[PDB]
Amino acid sequence: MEDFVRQCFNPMIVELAEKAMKEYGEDPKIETNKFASICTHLEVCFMYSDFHFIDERGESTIILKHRFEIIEGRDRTMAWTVVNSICNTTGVEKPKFLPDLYDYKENRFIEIGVTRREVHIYYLEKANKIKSEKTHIHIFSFTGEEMATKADYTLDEESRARIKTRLFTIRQEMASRGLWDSFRQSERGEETIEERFEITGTMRRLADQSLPPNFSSLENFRAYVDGFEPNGCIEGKLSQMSKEVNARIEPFLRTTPRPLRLPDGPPCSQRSKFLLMDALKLSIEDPSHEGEGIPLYDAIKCMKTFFGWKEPNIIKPHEKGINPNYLLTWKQVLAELQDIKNEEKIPRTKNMKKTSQLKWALGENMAPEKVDFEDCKDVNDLKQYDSDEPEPRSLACWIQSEFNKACELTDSSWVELDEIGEDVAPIEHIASMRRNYFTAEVSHCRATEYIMKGVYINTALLNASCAAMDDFQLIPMISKCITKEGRRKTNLYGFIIKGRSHLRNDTDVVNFVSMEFSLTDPRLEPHKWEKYCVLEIGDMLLRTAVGQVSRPMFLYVRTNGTSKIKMKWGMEMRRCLLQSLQQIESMIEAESSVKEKDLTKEFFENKSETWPIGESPKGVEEGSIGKVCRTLLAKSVFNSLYASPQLEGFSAESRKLLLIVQALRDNLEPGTFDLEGLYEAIEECLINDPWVLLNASWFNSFLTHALR
Amino acid sequence: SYSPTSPSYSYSPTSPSYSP
Amino acid sequence: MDVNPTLLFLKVPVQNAISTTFPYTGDPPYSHGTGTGYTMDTVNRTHKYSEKGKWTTNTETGAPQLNPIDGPLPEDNEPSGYAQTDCVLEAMAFLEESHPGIFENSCLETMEIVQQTRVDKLTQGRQTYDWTLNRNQPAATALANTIEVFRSNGLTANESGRLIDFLKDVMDSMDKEEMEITTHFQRKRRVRDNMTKKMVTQRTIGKKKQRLNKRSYLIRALTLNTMTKDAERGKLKRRAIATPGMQIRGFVYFVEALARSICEKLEQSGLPVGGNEKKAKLANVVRKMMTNSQDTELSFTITGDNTKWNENQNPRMFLAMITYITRNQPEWFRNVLSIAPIMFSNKMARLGKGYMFESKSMKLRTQVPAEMLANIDLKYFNKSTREKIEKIRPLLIDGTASLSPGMMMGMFNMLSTVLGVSILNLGQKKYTKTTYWWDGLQSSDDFALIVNAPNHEGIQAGVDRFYRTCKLVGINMSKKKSYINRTGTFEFTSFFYRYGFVANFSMELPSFGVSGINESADMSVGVTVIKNNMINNDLGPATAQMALQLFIKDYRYTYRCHRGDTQIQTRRAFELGKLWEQTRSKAGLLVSDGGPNLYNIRNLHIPEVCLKWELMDEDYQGRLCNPMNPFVSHKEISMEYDAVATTHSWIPKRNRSILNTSQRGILEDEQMYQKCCNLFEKFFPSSSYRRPVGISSMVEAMVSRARIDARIDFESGRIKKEEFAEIMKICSTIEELRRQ
Amino acid sequence: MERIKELRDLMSQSRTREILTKTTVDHMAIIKKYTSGRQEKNPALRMKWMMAMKYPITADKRIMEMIPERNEQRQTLWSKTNDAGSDRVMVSPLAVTWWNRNGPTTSTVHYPKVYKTYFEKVERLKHGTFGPVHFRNQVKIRRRVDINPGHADLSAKEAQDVIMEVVFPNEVGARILTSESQLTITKEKKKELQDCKIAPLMVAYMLERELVRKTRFLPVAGGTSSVYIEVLHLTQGTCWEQMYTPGGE
RNA sequence: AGUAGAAACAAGGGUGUAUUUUCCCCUCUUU
RNA sequence: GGGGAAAAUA
Lengths: 708, 20, 740, 249
Ligand SMILES: [Mg+2]
Ligand SMILES: [Mg+2]
Prior knowledge:
Chain A: Its cofactor is Mn(2+). Chain A: InterPro entries: INFV_PA, PA/PA-X, PA/PA-X_sf. Chain A: Influenza RNA polymerase is composed of three subunits: PB1, PB2 and PA. Interacts (via C-terminus) with PB1 (via N-terminus). The complex is a heterotetramer. Chain C is of the alpha+beta class. Among the domains of chain C are: 515-624, no CATH class; 663-739, no CATH class. Chain C contains 22 helices and 24 strands. In chain C, the strands form 8 sheets. Chain C has a 5-stranded mixed sheet with strand order 11-10-13-17-16. Chain C has a 4-stranded antiparallel sheet with strand order 18-19-12-20, with helices on both faces. The chains are: A alpha+beta, B little secondary structure, C alpha+beta, D alpha+beta. Chains in contact: A-B, A-C, A-D, C-D. Strand 20 (611-615) of chain A pairs antiparallel with strand 1 (2-3) of chain C. The structure holds magnesium ion (2 copies). The structure holds a RNA duplex.
């Protein structure tokens, strides 16, 4: 029947009918009666609308403003927007359902209906459905019977006769082919939309293959599940199940936990991007010279104020490194600085000459050339990249001393926080005084010095790497502090030569060479300086309390590397402050609600309340709120500095053990299922990271002091 | 006003004085 | 003295000080190379947990498939994927019985969604696998390529716009003997860079024609690309994740809609609720179980995580669950909701990028694709990769490993949660038939399970019964992860409950900082984040003030908008200073203009422009909010709409260049699409506000709109006859142009 | 007239004609989002390192007609772009500051009108009265409250329908306004929005802010109305309670 | 060498899924 | 309606 409609109706009409019928997910080869009905309706609507225009006077004419605007055949959105526009302009009532035509001469919507049964039934049905005495309804029949609203047939007798003869011809064609019976009998359900989604072909066989073992086809499985009822299947299967499949609760008594088993090997060495406790800084007081903000000029002034430079020499060679290259790099830095000092208009930034020493130190031309595999098939000596595990390293005593130093109180302020709005609410005043306490106790902590140092270094490295990708750039490690006298002081820790920084992935690394002044003899703890190559670069005349003492001043020179993510999280190191302060504040609040008053002054000034924070040969030691705040800040800062997968894994797998211990101390009768498995999981994360090893030792001490 | 203090507190080896 | 932060737990309970156990101030672990190793490990582990199943050969894909369902019952505590179909069906029957009408209403809602959903709904997804180019591309690009290829192949059923029509289109495509597609081809030319004087391989990418047989297209359609999850906290070792093609995302979306509908009507499901809602749900469950417990009754809480949750959920059990849920429903609904498990039971995991091989003798390195790993000498890999390849070799076809078992890393989170919740509710008094009983909450894999029994032996029996039932259905409880204590304290997905959920501020540290969108946007985001953290995660007043100070410092440094009255110097400093000496009201300037920061605890919820509006000077206020600021885009009604946004809402410079690569021929398509979309938006004013719908072509709709607008304008009288005639003639020629 | 001529020009081409003919209105959503090239991650880092560059902003070429290339200190503001289709231009924040300190000034600004809700918030805060603070153990109940009061007589769907009717009368669709309050609000907004010079989308968004009601699950203790939830951060604490009375009625 | 860690960078295509919750924003587009 | 950022699990 689709062929007949295609061969009879106009191509425009057939295409429009197909478009209208497909909008609701209808196929035109199987659902053919609806297709023919839509085609006939569209043809009747077009003939009704066509051949009728409005003259400039405003009267109907037959051969310019069209008399009838067509609304049928357009998409739902297009039809509804045209209807809305006409309704808004002409001011007529908005039809509840989508009409077919609009008459401008009388300004009303007209519904065109083509039906096969008697006209009165269809007219009554349509009138009841629309239920509005504002839109005209015109029913046409293939038998030659037409009915209108109030018998008002606006179309001229000639047009109605033409439509009637067209419908009669269509009906005669239907009858001649012996298909008018189905066409007449299918009209009842044409208005109903039935969804079809049948699995056939490849997908049917795929479904047949996705069933439990004892099924052969999807319909069989569907029939089985449809008739499925529950009768003791779970109980029977459980009875058949072996009793060895169980979850035995092993009590977690005070004698159950055991210390973690730290790894064995050579002591772990320092891996920070810069010295923490061994760093020496050359300082200038109240910088008011030329520049005052450019790192190079500040470095120049810092180096100028110190007299006593001597010939550098290797004292602690890097075992795997070419120490002469490090020596020549330091000499080249000194020569470049002198050359710049010679010139008048020193630039904001400097590029170091790509000498051989910098070529080797910065790892230039070390990566094998990358070639697409299509042109690498003929090579017979290919080997997969190594994926060996990290070398185990034992816990060393220097990391504990470094953490102890990081928690110390400093004389000079290290962060000068910005202003905020005026305080009006009482809560605002309480916040202000508590913030004053926290800032006083935190701005004078060495952890804040490390925060500022790392933030500045990472920011400068990122800026240099992105701005200059092909230049070996010199970056002095500059920091700003305020001494106990309140005078701005500019400190220089050394220099960083940044190599090529063509970073594409977040994990790509930039090699650089760090040279840091120090007063720590590398031979006291050589294992701590495995990767460095320490030089004795001067003799510093320190002003001791008793008097003046001459001490050697060394330069720790090493090659390090960092990535875009590492630099990014280095810039965001001030957040560490919050991680402590928040907690500290909570603690204070956690006590204040108990005493119905703010205990900040009591906690900070009188130091009446102390928390167990340190271990001594005498025993566990209690520190005041300030000490706890500094300890938490240092812990967070070291987390930032010594971040690694090992730290994350250890924290994740040890929070469970900490919570179990807390439950045991709460007399909640804690229980475990594979506590040995948990211990193995925790110990798998301790390999070589000094920070992780220190944390594991800390956890062992906590377990020892908490089991009792 | 609040000056931090530590009951646990030569030449400050990290930040010494060297000006002649 | 040796400072020991951990010893602080001696006084403060761990939960109250849990924030210090989270090292969220450091960079999270990242994957450095290919995820092929992790994908192979996951495939091998999934096949090892169910190796006792039945091996078969797919008659379409021709790849081995493992069916462990109804396999031998577990003998030990090791992970097992041998779920029992009858047990799962009984669990779902009891779920329906305990919540009568849940499945019927869920199915009705899902039918409503299916019948009234649009194809473009698939563009919400992130990077998706593309079979046309065999690589990861945005969801919109993937869907556009799929639709273009289908249209070129004659399968134009998706023109309707309904998603179900697109799924029928996928069904039809899966039956074509051969498929013609438009892949990307590469041309390599050796060139000399003028900045380094070194030879490089410039690459040009263009379009070509390719033909795929039935088997190749079927493999690609079922393919799920695999990569490595990055920036994941709390794991020493990484793991692989999967992204499916565009032929699988629609069915998965429908199944997830049904599962979400089911989970909404369940008090034991942790999804889709989250944040405060999930905490309230957990607190309600715990409080109700504690209250209902008799004084003599003993109650114990288990905090539990499941081991290899994704690798032990069989798609066949998802199909069985779907079939049972959709009982007494139209056949089409059952088919559309059951197709997704059908494809997931026959999915193929693409290994990934491949590997990197270095020849030190020749000083060379290369990247082997995953396709060549099946025909490579086994001596080149190291030991562990040698075992992986030797074990996974039987499943390789066209660079993909067949993996029937397993749910592939969170593709059915909601359905898996439904199964877990059914196992949870199987513990009521009417089903245990014993003094002990259990209940609780589950989300994906994690669960909190409270068990009550008269004595310790009853609690032990209840725990054993729950463990065995989970094993029967296919859920494996990770003994090392889980622990049990007396009710009152527990943990659920980083929410620590100790007689009340305790705040964990360490999780929200990364949100702090500068978003880097633009000055005003960054400031607003910062202040709003501080306020929200104050409200929710127990950020103190003073701590909030210090966070505000730090954010202002970082923002000022990032945007070089330091205070005007400051000695500091920078590129922007001179202009800010000149503005500063020009303004009489010094408190009206925005921070981006070097003005003072007036924000405090009181007014963290007020935008800066509105906060500083009153104190702004008339001339500065006009300049800042000028209607004709050039830095923001303008929309034509050559008159243009007046702008309202401040000049600080500029658009930053975005770059998309690829090292040694040109894509002009591919970006011209995007340019043409953008031009056509802009012209349509010009024709239809509401397109930007709400997505338009319709089956008519763009040109047809636009010319029809123009005609109706001209007619209506004439009727209202806004135009005379001449413009009417001109518009009608131009529309008619546009019509004939299109037609011919 | 201009738009139809532009459509004819676009139809004149071949590839554009194919795009316009073979793409349906629905698929316009797919091709609107069609994007090629790389996607940049870590917006924070990119902004952090980009702003140090000379020209990190992109503006329309119109900026060339008002912003001078340099200021009195010879500092370049914008530079001609080579990687653009002649419609954009690189711009420095120096340009933004120059516009803010010497740009054209006008007495008419749409900010107080579009963002009237935020100004109402400011007025409520300004006239509020602050009481004392009680340091007492605070109990928090997690419940669903309203963060945007919206219109009491209008629901979410009713508000959306009203917004669609007011802003886009000719595309409302089959929806019909039923409630009398809906009609009153629609005609009032129509009257207030006559001859407005703002884009229809932005007017729709401000109407959404003023009318639609937004609810979120928050831990509250005490007040529950919108005027209190917005200030919840200031009047509620884990250990302290702050008495407050917003200036609003 | 160094970074780093089950696989890579150390130049010559730049890789980031599903579900849920919260926050912000309103328009990108040619070496 | 859409797009970005943060977190959790998978
Ligand atoms: Mg798990
Ligand atoms: Mg889990």
